[PDB]
Structures are given as structure tokens and as C-alpha cells.
Scaffold this motif. Structure first.
Motif, short mmCIF file in Angstrom:
data_model
loop_
_atom_site.label_atom_id
_atom_site.label_comp_id
_atom_site.label_asym_id
_atom_site.label_seq_id
_atom_site.Cartn_x
_atom_site.Cartn_y
_atom_site.Cartn_z
N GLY A 14 26.04 37.52 83.83
CA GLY A 14 26.57 36.45 84.66
C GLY A 14 25.60 35.29 84.82
O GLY A 14 25.94 34.14 84.54
N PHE A 15 24.37 35.58 85.26
CA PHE A 15 23.39 34.53 85.50
C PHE A 15 23.06 33.76 84.23
O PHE A 15 22.80 32.56 84.28
CB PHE A 15 22.11 35.14 86.10
N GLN A 16 23.09 34.43 83.08
CA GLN A 16 22.68 33.80 81.84
C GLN A 16 23.75 32.89 81.25
O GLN A 16 23.42 31.93 80.56
CB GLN A 16 22.26 34.86 80.82
N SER A 17 25.03 33.17 81.50
CA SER A 17 26.10 32.49 80.78
C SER A 17 27.08 31.72 81.66
O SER A 17 27.73 30.80 81.15
CB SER A 17 26.90 33.49 79.93
N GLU A 18 27.20 32.05 82.95
CA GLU A 18 28.30 31.51 83.75
C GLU A 18 28.15 30.01 83.99
O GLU A 18 29.10 29.24 83.77
CB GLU A 18 28.39 32.26 85.09
N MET A 19 26.98 29.55 84.43
CA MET A 19 26.86 28.18 84.89
C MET A 19 26.83 27.19 83.73
O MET A 19 26.52 27.54 82.59
CB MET A 19 25.61 28.01 85.76
N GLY A 20 27.15 25.94 84.04
CA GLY A 20 27.14 24.88 83.05
C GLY A 20 28.31 23.93 83.15
O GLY A 20 28.25 22.80 82.66
N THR A 21 29.39 24.37 83.78
CA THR A 21 30.59 23.57 83.99
C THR A 21 30.69 23.13 85.45
O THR A 21 30.12 23.77 86.34
CB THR A 21 31.85 24.36 83.59
N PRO A 22 31.39 22.03 85.73
CA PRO A 22 31.47 21.53 87.11
C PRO A 22 32.04 22.57 88.06
O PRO A 22 33.06 23.20 87.78
CB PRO A 22 32.40 20.32 86.98
N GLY A 54 23.67 25.60 81.67
CA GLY A 54 23.94 26.61 80.67
C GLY A 54 25.24 26.44 79.92
O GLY A 54 25.85 25.36 79.91
N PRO A 55 25.71 27.52 79.29
CA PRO A 55 26.85 27.41 78.37
C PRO A 55 28.21 27.33 79.05
O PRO A 55 29.21 27.10 78.35
CB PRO A 55 26.74 28.68 77.53
N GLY A 56 28.30 27.53 80.36
CA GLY A 56 29.53 27.26 81.08
C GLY A 56 30.64 28.27 80.91
O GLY A 56 31.81 27.88 80.79
N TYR A 57 30.31 29.56 80.91
CA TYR A 57 31.35 30.59 80.79
C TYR A 57 32.30 30.57 81.98
O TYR A 57 33.48 30.90 81.84
CB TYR A 57 30.69 31.96 80.65
N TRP A 58 31.79 30.20 83.17
CA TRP A 58 32.62 30.15 84.37
C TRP A 58 33.85 29.27 84.16
O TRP A 58 34.96 29.64 84.57
CB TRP A 58 31.78 29.63 85.54
N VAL A 434 25.33 27.38 70.67
CA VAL A 434 25.78 26.55 71.78
C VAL A 434 25.09 25.19 71.70
O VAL A 434 23.86 25.12 71.62
CB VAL A 434 25.51 27.22 73.13
N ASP A 435 25.88 24.12 71.73
CA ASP A 435 25.36 22.78 71.98
C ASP A 435 25.43 22.55 73.48
O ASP A 435 26.52 22.38 74.03
CB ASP A 435 26.15 21.73 71.20
N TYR A 436 24.28 22.55 74.14
CA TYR A 436 24.27 22.46 75.60
C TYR A 436 24.63 21.08 76.13
O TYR A 436 24.86 20.95 77.34
CB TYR A 436 22.90 22.90 76.12
N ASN A 437 24.71 20.06 75.27
CA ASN A 437 25.19 18.76 75.73
C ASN A 437 26.72 18.75 75.83
O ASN A 437 27.28 18.30 76.84
CB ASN A 437 24.71 17.65 74.80
N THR A 438 27.40 19.25 74.81
CA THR A 438 28.86 19.23 74.74
C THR A 438 29.50 20.55 75.15
O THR A 438 30.71 20.58 75.40
CB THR A 438 29.32 18.87 73.32
N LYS A 439 28.72 21.63 75.22
CA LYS A 439 29.19 23.00 75.46
C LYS A 439 30.07 23.52 74.33
O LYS A 439 30.73 24.55 74.50
CB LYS A 439 29.93 23.13 76.81
N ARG A 440 30.08 22.86 73.18
CA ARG A 440 30.82 23.35 72.03
C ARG A 440 30.13 24.57 71.43
O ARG A 440 28.90 24.71 71.48
CB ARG A 440 30.96 22.26 70.96
#
Lengths: 477, 487, 477, 487
Positions: A14-22, A54-58, A434-440
């Protein structure tokens, strides 16, 4: 060719992948505060990267699951973040009482938005035909249970994490509550991920930058003692609301002898790093303080074993006991060769797939509990070695099954790149880039290799040549 | 996304891939004798590997084609071996003066073709038909090339020429070879036109003449160092193309082109742009101006030959790396440490990674070469060669996607490019270097002759089945990270 | 500590070091024409460097000798260039008659300017207390005896070098003439330098870019046949005017077995590359039709043996005979490591000082003729390996003497950087670094080490640690 | 060619070099306990090597000095170990308030010195006198340093502080240490002034405070991470210098300086010049403005203390590499892959070779640091540290000559630099890294304690005996070729 019911998939935290999206930020963990701390940053204990980038899995979990389905994967292991469900403070441990009224009281304090969001993620996961292993804990604790900066400074008057039985009690109730809420979606449970790393790096290996980073043999033992009871009480808690299997996930190395005269050092290393822990939660055999006992409340609290593995550890015998050697296994130079001539990853970890056969068969012969390979992967942005790493380790799992070991799945770490703790984003373990700018998300060639394995349930004839060591001559060495 | 009719496929050579199965050995070429020669082996001119231990396409072509079909490929370029069809000497022609410098016509008619048929090896002819029939049945568009370097021994004894004896069969130094090649080319088209979609006369004639008579450390036959004889060989090979073109057109209406080795000539500094134009003239434009516009130099005179003009329908663009040049006072010079002349498995002076062969990563060069051919001649093109020596497959995924992207860019600029043919489908015998240079999307185990898919082959399937670089693999349009590679 | 009469010094060649100063150019050799040839340059057979831009020993010999004296050196081996003395054409070989009137007739054709200049150089050499070994031939031939471009093209109607017995006849007279003129300055004589390399690379190893570069087993044998008689006739010619020792200088490798089952391959390789040549000029033995025939005009034509050495050659037995292996010895990658884990030079030559002991003792046990180490050095511009190379090989000479071999000197290659044949100036063998723009000489640290050895006549305690392999980990792999 | 009075020599530390022979062990320091601590060893904070297995200078000093004399050296900088002279606690002073933040004066007089003498270890005192007497008898100019990191255990228990317990002896966090250090310094000068030429109060106090309380992964004691306590330690160490300066001057008229660790701060791009100025302020100028001009910040805001002003006669410049910085919005940051933070035995991101320690080759920085110190304070300088970790001796010949050349350049610009002291004469114990980092001109066999001359030692002998970089060795004023090295 693998058994019909064997499943290929991936593991994720969770901590490694969830965050990154609004809207995804979770600031209420010891780990979040730890990696934002100015002093930790100036000391170089943490990378300076922040998980909220991060990659924004949330937010993007549907895209993750789309790619996993196209890749032919059939199993996934994830965790819920305790801090998201209970962000605010709530008003020997041989028993923790669990009953309907207690669960309903806990329900009044739970964050329903986070609870419903996890339900949507897990429903979408199951709708792709993915078998679901739910893990309860993957290192970050709620801040109201652990202020790691205070402990780092030598102040033990605040929330002290796994040094307090308060955390043991609350963890058991958390685990029972989650199973109570999600049992209809879950196939198998795990209580925690790699508890030996939490206690070991947190209180001994402090250069690793893990919280709370307070150097103490004694407090390391107390943390491991409390985390062992926490597993047993969480096991009983889950079983009071569910009949489904409950296991644990543990970090392993294959301990190898430097010379043929070091075979006794191997057994000592296995005792001190592996068997002592599992004898406690399977057979009830533990030592409390300076005395060895058999606790009935610990015996038999395990249905399956999650085998994490990535490299070996080379040991030799001393007069005092044994020691592990640098230049092999975990302690090599990055993007180089080990002292044995084997290539090393972006993390400095040695290529050694034989070790996975060693660990699986030894767990099987001692306890005869079935296993999942819950972690196997490599830090490799360029994807030079991962195709060889993937096929070679999958082959060793096939070898273990042929020997009689009951291994029911292989879960690669990981589907996509993510935040690698104190090292930040620079260590890239993903089959997908993962492109951390676009999250693609992008498919590395090893992801195409994995699709061949998963959709065919076997290492096909076409890719058998990858069951080999990556050629060292073209690599940096 | 590529044009509707654009095709992704591969290129392959007879001498490099055919042998390896029992009964497939062709001992009747200059190249076969050349690589078996004890003195060449002791000098290290040849690797010591032997082509009869190769990947076995002669016997196992169905397995090759199965894998290409699974990979989604839609076009293939192969050649027939002259020596297999005509292993024995043909009698001297009645009216043909071999002291005449220019071959302006070679008469082709039905009775002449029938007389040739009586000398042809029918076993080899029928076997090629079976190979090409199986190829077409997989939906592969077929480019047939007539010549890919080895000559029949009765036309060229390369050991004799190496020793300085010019009284025997002397290959491209003799107009007899020009005469016989035109009749060979017409004969093959006469026999195979029903299966062929487009024709090529020859593969990389500039390499045959350049390495054969100048770059003699490369170990190419006959290995006789001479500026003058290099020019004579190139002069004859130019007429041989023109006569082969007319010969094929006398029995076929299908397009006839040629396949040529290219580099992208790049300036060291911004002051060297004139050196680039000089290098392009001396290595590229002089040859194609001859066979397209008829403009050639014979001896010490510049002319326009009517029998050479207009003998080309399309251009086969082979490419793998650049050449960096700078101005001198005498003219221009090419620089080591770039392009073709780097250390193996290292980095160039520009910081770019090099292959198992020592060739520099430079996909931009393919855009440069394609657009320059288009602007000068406006003839449509195929990329008939692009590949990398890479046993481990560390770089080939980046190499594949980057160069395909540059082809897409050339098409957007207006260049008429109709296909991309990777070199190669599987590993094969790389001339004097032997089997150690592995160019295949598929890895070959030479003990079992089994084929294995390198991950770049899975990448190519994504490209070919989608007819485009998909979003999923766009990140491979980039330079392979040099830090984890050997320096 | 070495014997009282043991001498430390250097070896040097005329074509490689003489040119570079105004008036020093010698355009009248096959080698000069060979490296200026446009076709050879375009093929990459020669580097494009030109010897007339060299270190300028012809003009600056006093500076060379100053530095050698400061370094404590006591012996030097040099050669005169045949082409400088006789630039213009002059009007079985079991005998070449030498008498006073013939020498006086030769004197009328000799270039007196070049003769006096050599006398001035050698006088200055002796005035520094340097023992003087004069070599007659070090590869370039007068153009009137060998046009190498013509032979390369397959035309054998012109001057054909060592393929013609005219060269044998004239060489014997050249050698007798030089001894007649210089005997007062010379201490010991050598007829020629490395004749096996002249014939081997000239007619078999043609990728090396040595003249005439005509690939032919048969002509290689003829060249070696003629060069053997040329040695014997030159020996007799010198002895007709001098009583001083006459030897020969020969290129050697230490032939080593790949496995313990390959010792017979070593003996075969030593026969084919070493013993056949020296049995001919020492014992008169040549093989004709599976019988050991004995030429009286060849027997006993050697007083001492010049041992050149720089690396090993690893061989294994085949059914047909034996073969040498790449990745060892001469055939390694440049600036790398061998398949045995040993570092390689700028030339790709493997570090193997043990081989020098092997070669010295084997020559001694077979013939019991005294020896000089007339060549030992390494291509190493940076001077990373040369300090270890120097001390290690000098130690092996000390070992050979302790075993009983009569070794009387060690001559390093070379005092200063010079023109290394087809490779040009980029291969730098000097204890002193040469700036070819200014012709200034610089002391590499290995030169300071050599001064310690030479002035003390021993490997001192202070530098014993250099008797070791250069550490491989910090070097390029 | 250098000025007539310029001296070439070496620097050395007591804890790193003294121990190694039986009976030479000094167990009574924070550093000794620190490197023997089981928890520090298990965490990898210290290497596991132990200083009592070191090169044995305490017993074998004559062999050291013999080799230095053979090398032509004419100056040495050494230190006395506080713990050897005063191994036992001294009683609490009668009139001294330890809660008072500022120590503005420490009274020194004859009777107080005689009382201190009653507690001193006379054997250790006389042994140091014999070492320094031998040094002077060889014509070596003598710089005596008072402090080179280890403190007496009775003044600092570092394991207790690491654990967060501040009720014991707390080292530089206590003004008790400030008071006693001033009396120690005055006492040593009182005893050794006849042998000393110039004094230094301490070695690299910025490293003691910086690594001890911020850079805790370095494994320096007490390893307690705290910005605030780092400031208090540096505050106390500054007053300790001033009081030690006054203490020495009360018994001696000879020059008193300080030795400080420096980097050359370099801009990543031409837009980062203001980041350079900021880094120099925060890492260099703040400290020297305090002890030269009296300008300090106590707690919140800035002042000028008269008791700190003018307490410096010369500056010891330590240097080994650069630090590359770039501008941020918050301020500046230093970059990995340059300077201190490179891979070992490799190349930096700028293509320059790195040492066994991972430090970048950058001799120009020494010119930068020397000239900037000169222009700001116009106090004369010694280069008191310059060296490289290099067991094989591949780079040290270039490192030595290049940095000596930069000193010559600084003198030509007008900087008053009076000597160059290489680190070090022989290999020694490199703190938390143990024995594997070898800085010596002489290689040490730790089994036999024998010393061997690396070739760079022969190079240094040429420099020192001639008082110049001779023509013979000028080519070593260059970067070590990277191509033959690992990269």
C-alpha cells in the motif's frame, strides 16, 4: 508445466504504490513522517523522494488491473493500510477478546470513505478473475501508535510502535475487523509482511534508514517478541470471523557455505534467522527473556507460509560462531559482479536462483505447510537481467514442486515500479515501467516474457534459454 | 501507425543460413573454399567456423516459416545461390570478346533460356520452389534477390587470385562473370516469376568490391590489395546489374531494384558539412547516379552511357550505424571511435553503446539516409537490412523500436518507404567472423538446430501484429542505458 | 642480490628510435616504403604513423645516454641499420669468402657520413661505462635488396628479401664489414634480432601488417631457411675479423598446458617454435625426409643466446597435434583480464613472469650456453602495471641464476618510447615517456624503480612488494 | 621551483598510527570504546577492524622517521593523545558554573600547571618527548597539534550518548570539556615548547561536529542525530579553540593555528554560482569569521565576542576533493556522483577517476581553496592534508604531482603557503573504515609491521630533495588515464 491450480501473479504494498493521484495522500504513518523528516534527509538515511509522488494505484487501480489481466496473471497479494482505516486515536498477550459488540464499536471509528474505496479496488480485482491474498500489515503504523522521531531521539514516553503491547492489542482487533468487513472478497489471509525486516533494520541495521532507527539489541528482541504475539492474536482474531486460511509472509535468504567446512555455520544462520521465528508460531517454542518455554497460545497459529526470496547469503565458521561475507548476496556493488563472478542488480544483489529451491524445500521438510512464493524480483530499470531472473527462478519453483514441496503460486515483485522505502523511486522492480510525471505504464520485454509463462502455465520451449545466468561480458564489471 | 500496405519482415542470405542439415552442403563457391583454406585459417583471416555447421534453413525452412508466421511477419527477402543452380562450368560463348571493356547488351531469348535449362541442377531448382511455395503459403510478400556474395568456383578461384595469379577464373575482374550473371538473373526470373513479388539483382556490391580488394584485413575473398582492381570490380558489377535488369525485364514485368550498404555520414563539428557531402558522393551517389542516370567514369573519362540509364525501379536501403567525418586540407577523413570503428561491447567517443561487433547505436542515421535517397531520386524504398549483433539481447529491444520509429518519421516527411526487414530472423554464419556474431531475433542452438525466442522477438511480434509501435512499448524508442553495460 | 658481473640495461632498435631529428631520415628500407604505402594505409595494415616523427636518437643520443647513466644502467644492445651504411646497390650457402681486399672494396661503397655518425654514438655510449652488445640486423632491409610492395602484389621478379640467397650472401659480408670497422668498441656481437618473427609475420600472420605480407606457408619456410644460413655465414664472417663472442636474439614464449593432460602438447610446441631453430645453428641438425641430417657448415655457430620474452602461450593437445588458445598470452583483449584472471597490457599481452624462469632454465638445460635477457617490457603509457612487471620479471631472472643457469644481464625494452612497427607510436614500451612534439623525455615512476634496482644490483627490501601481480580490481575488465 | 624556506613533509594522527605493538594500546578514549562496541559492529557503523592491530608508530617511530629522512622530507605534523597524558578523571573545579553557556576565560598560571603535573602520566609524557626529540634530530620542522578527535573516556562516554542518555560525560556538549581542553593545551605547550616550531589547537573540528551529530551513517561518535546538538558541539569547540589559544600564548610566543577540512565548492551549471557562495558560507567562512574576527551567532542572533577575536596566527588547509552544488528554491544542494560521493574505483559523472574511497580527482580545487583563504584573511597557510586512498598506487603519482603543482600556482598568485604535508607517510587506521583504506606513501604489512616504498614515494623524494617538480616528472601533472582503469 505446472499443476492445473498453480497461479502466477504479483505482490504489491500500500505505502509503496497507492499514492500519486489527487486525493490519495496518507500522511498519518510513522513511515510518512520518517521520510519527510529534515534530519533524516540531511543524514542521508532517506533518499529525499516522497511517496505522495508515486505511481498512483489509489486512483489508477483499474489500469493496473487491465495490464495484469492482459498479462495472464491469476493471483494478487495486496495489503490495506491500517492508517487509512483508523487515522485517529482509539480510547505476554495470550488473548485478545473479539466479539460482535466490539467489532460494531470499532466500526463507528473507521473511516468509511477509505473502507469503501478499498472495497471498490478489491471488487475490481476479483472481477478480473484474480485470486486474492489479503495482507494486513506491510510496515507503516498509524502515527497515534508510533512516533518514530521521538524514539530515534531516545525518548520512550510516547507511542513506541512494536515496543508497546498496546500495538499488539490494537493490531489483533484491526485484523479481525478487516476480515469481518472483507471476507466475501478474500480468498486467503496473511497477517504481516516480513516482520524480521521491521525488527532487524529498525533496531539493528540502522544505516538502512528504517524507522525508528534506534540501535539496540535488547529493543530489537522486544519488538520481535511483541510482533510474534501480534501475529498469533491476529490469527485468532481472523479465525473468529472467518474459516479461510491464514498465513504469514517472511523475508528469506539462502544461506550458503563459503567452503565445504562451513556447513555448520549454515545451520546456525538458518536457526538464528529463520527457524527460531517459525518454531515459535508453529510449535509454540519461544524464549522469553533468558529462558526457553512452550507457549500454548502461540502453537499452531499458521496455515501456510509466504516465501519471499531474492538472493543468497554466504557464511563461514568462526570460533565465536559464524559470520556473513561481503561481496556476495545482499552486499555487492551495484551493477557489477560478485566475488563468485555472478552479476549484480541495480540494488547490488547477487543473481542466485538455486537459493529459491533451497529455501522452499527446507521449509517443506521441516513443517510440511504449503507455500506461496510471495516475493521474487530484481531492481533493473534497463531490463537487462530481469528476463533471465524471471525464467530462472520460475524454473526453480518447478524443481521444488517436482521434489514434493506443496507450492501453489509464484507472485513476482512487482507489477509496476514503486517507492522503495529509504531508497526512493530509483530502485525499479516493475515488470511495467512507471513514468512518474504522467503515471503511464510501459511494458518492459520481461513483461512480455511473463505473459508467455502465465498464459501457458509453463516455461514454454520458446523461452527456455532464459533459464541461465545473464552474460557477464557485455555488462559492467 | 504505418500505411495500410506497409509490411514488417526479415532478410536472410543463402550462404549464411542454408547449410547445417545433411545433404545441404554447397562446396562449389569461392566463399566455401575461402573459409576452408588452411592458410586463411592460420592467418586468422577467417574464424575457423564452417558454414556446413549452420542453422539448417535448407532442411528446416518450415520451422523458420512457422516462427515468422507466429511473429506476425508479412514480407521476406531471400536469395538463390548461383552455385546451387549451376555448379558446373558452362562452355565459352561463341561470339563474345572478353577483352572488350564494356558489356552494353546481353541477348536473352526463349531458345537461349532453354539451352541454359539443360545445364541447370534440377534438384536445387525444385527444392527452392518448395521453399518459396511454403513461404508464400504463410502470406509472406516475397522479394527475391539474385546474388548475395558467393560466386560459383568455376567463375572465381579466390586462392589463386590471393596469390597474385590472374590466369584463372577471376570473379568480378572478368567480363565473363558479367555476361553469365545477366543470363543467370534472366533464367531465375523465367523459372520463378509466378512466386516472386519484387526482384533485387544483388546485395551490397560496394562491400564485395571494397572489402575484397581494399579492406583485406576483413578476410573477404579474394583478399588481393589493389585500388585499381577494386575499381575494375565495381565497374563490372555495375554493368552486371544493368544487364541483369534488362534480362529480368525481358521475361517479367515486376519491379527490379538493388540492395546497397549505407552509413549515415555525420560531421564532427559544424565546420565539416562539406566533408559529409564529399563522403556521400564517394560512397553513395557515384554508384546510384550510374545505374539511375547513366553517369559513370570509365578509366580517366566521365560519360553518360545509355545502356545504364534508368535501370532501377526501387532502392533497398541497408543501414546499421553512422560514419563521422571531418574536413582535411586534402579532402576528408573518417574518425575511429565512432560508427563502424569502436571497441566491442563498450561506448563510443560520443558516449553511445556499441554492439558485440563494435558498431555504434545511432538510429537517427536511418532517417538521414532514407530522406536523402528520396530527395535525390524519388524512387520508393524498402529497409532491407537493420539489425545488431547481440547474443544477450541487452540492446536489441531498444535498437528495434528506435529504428522502426525513424522509418515512421521518414514516411511523415514524404519518403515512400514500403517495408522494414530486420536482419535477421535467426542467427547465422557471419562470413569471416563465423557464428559468434549473432544477429537473430531467434537464438540458434547449433548443436540441436533448435530456435529460441529472444525477448526482442516478442517485442517484434507486438510491432508486426499491430502494424505500429504500440503505446505499451514506446519507452524502447531510446538509447540503451550505458551505465549498466560494459565500458 | 645478483652476481658482481651481472649488468642491468636496455635494448633498442635503429628503425624504431633513430629518426625524429633533422637529417636523420632513412627512406631506403623495405619497412620505410611499407609504412608509407597508400594501399597499406587504407587497408589499416599500418597505423599511418611515420617513423620520421620518432624520438630522434640519431640526433639526441647524448640525452638518451645521460638518462641511462643517471638510471645506473651498465649495458646496452643496439643495432646498425644496413640501409644507412649501404644505401645503394652493389654490383645452400655453405661459405662466403671474407678477406682483406674484399673488405677494402666494400669500404669504397660505404656511406662514410653514416659510419662516422655511428662511431660517435657508440663512443659516447662507451664513455658512460656501458657494456656494448652490437646487433647487425633488426628487420628493415635495404630497398635494393627487398621491394616489399612488389612481393605483396605477387611479383617475384624483383628484389625479394629473405626469399633470395643474394640477401644471404650480402648479409654475411655486411656483418663482417661492421665488425671489421667497430670491433674496438664492441664487447659482444649478435647477428640478428628475432628472425622467427620476420618470417612468421611476414608470410603467415599477414594481418599483423609486416612486410611483405604475402600469405604462403612455403615461402615462409624458404625465408626461415635462408635466414638460418645467413646467421651461420655472418657468424663465420665476424669470426674472421674478431675473437669476441657472437650470439643471436630470438623471440620466445613460455608454452603452458591448459590441463595436466597437455604436457605433450607443450613439448611439441617447444620443438616447432624453438628447438628446431637452435638445434640447427648449435648442433647442425636439420631434418630431411624423416631423418636427422647434419650440416657441418651450420654446427657450432653460436656462443651465447639472447632470450627475448614477454608472455606465455597456452596450448592443448588435439588428435592432429596441438593448438594454442585465445584469451591467454599474446591473444587477449587490450587493457582487460585474461581467461585466467591475469591483467593484460595496452597490447593485449598477459602478465606471466613465471614464463621467463621456464624459458631461461629450459635453454640452459638443453645447450648450456650463457644467456642475456635481451628483451622484456610492456606496452603501458599510464605506467600502471610496469612497476610490477619490472620487479616480477627481474626476480624470476634471480630465480633462474639460483637454479644454475648462466644469465649475465637483463635488458629492458625499452629505455624510451619508440615506433612500434605497424602499430605506430601508440604502443609505449619506455621506462621514459617521449613527447613526440618536443622530443623531451620524462621519467615514469617505473624508471625510478629501475634506478633502485640497477644502482644497487638487487631488488631492495623497499620494493619487494612489487614482485606481485598488478591488482586487477581497480583496472579495466 | 618553490621558495627557499618551503618545506615538504607529512601529517599523521595518534589514534590512527600509534597502536600496533604490544603495550601501546590506549583503551581510554571514546573512539576506542566506539569501534569495539558490539552493536556498532553489528550495524556496520564500524568496520570491525581494531586500532590495536595498527602500524605501530608508538614503538617503531624511529623507522618511520628514518624513511621520512631518506625521502627528503623536512616537516611533520603530529598530535599528542589527551587520553595518554591524563587517563584518569580530574576533580571538579571549585569556581566554575557548568550551566553557563559562554567560557570567556580560563586562568592559566604556574601553580595551576604544577598541580596539573601531579595528575599527568609521566611515562607517556617522556615517550612523546623521545619521539619529538628524534624528529628534531633529523632536521624536521615540527608542527604540534593538540587534538585529533578521540577524547578521554572520563570526558565522553559515546555509547551512553548514542542511546539518548545525556546524564554522563557528554564530550563537546559540555563546557567541562572546553575548560579542561584549554588547560591541557597550555600544559602541553608548557612541557614541549623547546621542541615545537608551530602549534595547532585541533584537527578538523567541523568533521567532529558534523559527522558526530548529523552524518551518522559515517559511524563517528557519538552518532546521535540532532541539528541542535550539532550546533552546541560546534559552539563549544569554537570556545575551546580560543581558550586553548590563550592558554598556549600564556607560556609560549610561537605561532598558534588550526587545521580544518575543506572542499572546493563547484557549480553544476553557470547558473549555480550563488549556490557556491552559500556553501562556502555555511561550511567554511562562518567558522573562521568566528575565530579570526569574533563574529558568531549565539542561539538566535548575531554578535561580536571580543574573547574570540584574533585567536589565530595561521591556517592549516586540508583538502582532497571538490563538492558540486546546484541552486534550489529553498537554497542549495550538493550532488552525488561528484566529489566525496562517487563509486569506488570508477569514474565520476564528469568522467574523472575516483579513488579506493570513492573520491574524485580534482587538483584545481586546491588552488581555489588556498587563494580564497588568502584573499579573505591574509594569514599564511600550510597544506596540512592532501592524499588519496590507493593501495595499488595507480593514481597517487598523478595525484601527488598535480596537487603540488597547484600549490606552486597559488604561491605565484600571492598566497603565502609555506609547506605541503601529504597524508600520509604510511598506511594507517582510517576511523570507521578500518585498515582497508590505504593512504600511505609507504605500504604497511600489518602482520610484520614492515614498510614498503610505493613508487609514488620515489616520486615524492624527487620533489622534496630538489625542492621542485623536476623536468623529469612534469608529465605527472595530469589526470590518470581513465581508459585502462575500471569504469
Amino acid at each position: 508445466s505446472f499443476p492445473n491450480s498453480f497461479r502466477f501473479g504479483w505482490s504489491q504494498a500500500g505505502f509503496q504504490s497507492e499514492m500519486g493521484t489527487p486525493g490519495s495522500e496518507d500522511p498519518n504513518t510513522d513511515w510518512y513522517k520518517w521520510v519527510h523528516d529534515p534530519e533524516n534527509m540531511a543524514a542521508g538515511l532517506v533518499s529525499g523522494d516522497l511517496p505522495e509522488n508515486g505511481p498512483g494505484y489509489w486512483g489508477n487501480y483499474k489500469t493496473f488491473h487491465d495490464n495484469a489481466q492482459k498479462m495472464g496473471l491469476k493471483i494478487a497479494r495486496l495489503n490495506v493500510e491500517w492508517s487509512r482505516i483508523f487515522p485517529n486515536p482509539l480510547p505476554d498477550v495470550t488473548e485478545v477478546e473479539i466479539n460482535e459488540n466490539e467489532l460494531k464499536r470499532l466500526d463507528e471509528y473507521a473511516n468509511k470513505d477509505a473502507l469503501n474505496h478499498y472495497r471498490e479496488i478489491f471488487k475490481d480485482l476479483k472481477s478480473r478473475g484474480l485470486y486474492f491474498i489479503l495482507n494486513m500489515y506491510h510496515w507503516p503504523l498509524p502515527l497515534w501508535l508510533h512516533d518514530p522521531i521521538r524514539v530515534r531521539r531516545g525518548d520512550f514516553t510516547g507511542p513506541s510502535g512494536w515496543l508497546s503491547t498496546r500495538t499488539v492489542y490494537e493490531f489483533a482487533r484491526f485484523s479481525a475487523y478487516i476480515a469481518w468487513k472483507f471476507d466475501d472478497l478474500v480468498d486467503e489471509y496473511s497477517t504481516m509482511n516480513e516482520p524480521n525486516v521491521v525488527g532487524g533494520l529498525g533496531y539493528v541495521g540502522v544505516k538502512s534508514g528504517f524507522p525508528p532507527g534506534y540501535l539496540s539489541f535488547e529493543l530489537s528482541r522486544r519488538a520481535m517478541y511483541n510482533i510474534i504475539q501480534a501475529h498469533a492474536r491476529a490469527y485468532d482474531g481472523i479465525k473468529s470471523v472467518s474459516k479461510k486460511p491464514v498465513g504469514i509472509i517472511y523475508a528469506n535468504s539462502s544461506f550458503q557455505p563459503l567452503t565445504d567446512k562451513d556447513m555448520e555455520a549454515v545451520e546456525m544462520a538458518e536457526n538464528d534467522n529463520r527457524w527460531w521465528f517459525f518454531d515459535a508460531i508453529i510449535r509454540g517454542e519461544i524464549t522469553r527473556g533468558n529462558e526457553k518455554i512452550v507457549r500454548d497460545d502461540l502453537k499452531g497459529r499458521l496455515d501456510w507460509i509466504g516465501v519471499n526470496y531474492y538472493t543468497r547469503t554466504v557464511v563461514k565458521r568462526t570460533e565465536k560462531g559464524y559470520v556473513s561475507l561481503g561481496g556476495y548476496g545482499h552486499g555487492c556493488e551495484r551493477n557489477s559482479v560478485s566475488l563468485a563472478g555472478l552479476p549484480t542488480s541495480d540494488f547490488g544483489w547477487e543473481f542466485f536462483p538455486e537459493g529459491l529451491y533451497d529455501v522452499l524445500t527446507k521449509y517443506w521438510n521441516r513443517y510440511h505447510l504449503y507455500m506461496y512464493v510471495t516475493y521474487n524480483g530484481i531492481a533493473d530499470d534497463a531490463d537487462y537481467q530481469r528476463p533471465y531472473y524471471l525464467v530462472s527462478h520460475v524454473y526453480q519453483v518447478h524443481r521444488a514442486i517436482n521434489s514434493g514441496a506443496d507450492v501453489r503460486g509464484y507472485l513476482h515483485w512487482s507489477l509496476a515500479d514503486n517507492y522503495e522505502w529509504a531508497s526512493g523511486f530509483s530502485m525499479r522492480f516493475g515488470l511495467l515501467k512507471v513514468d512518474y510525471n504522467t503515471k503511464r505504464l510501459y511494458w518492459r520485454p520481461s513483461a512480455l516474457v511473463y505473459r508467455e509463462i502465465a498464459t501457458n502455465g509453463a516455461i514454454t520451449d520458446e523461452i527456455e534459454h532464459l533459464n541461465s545466468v545473464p552474460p557477464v561480458k557485455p555488462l559492467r564489471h
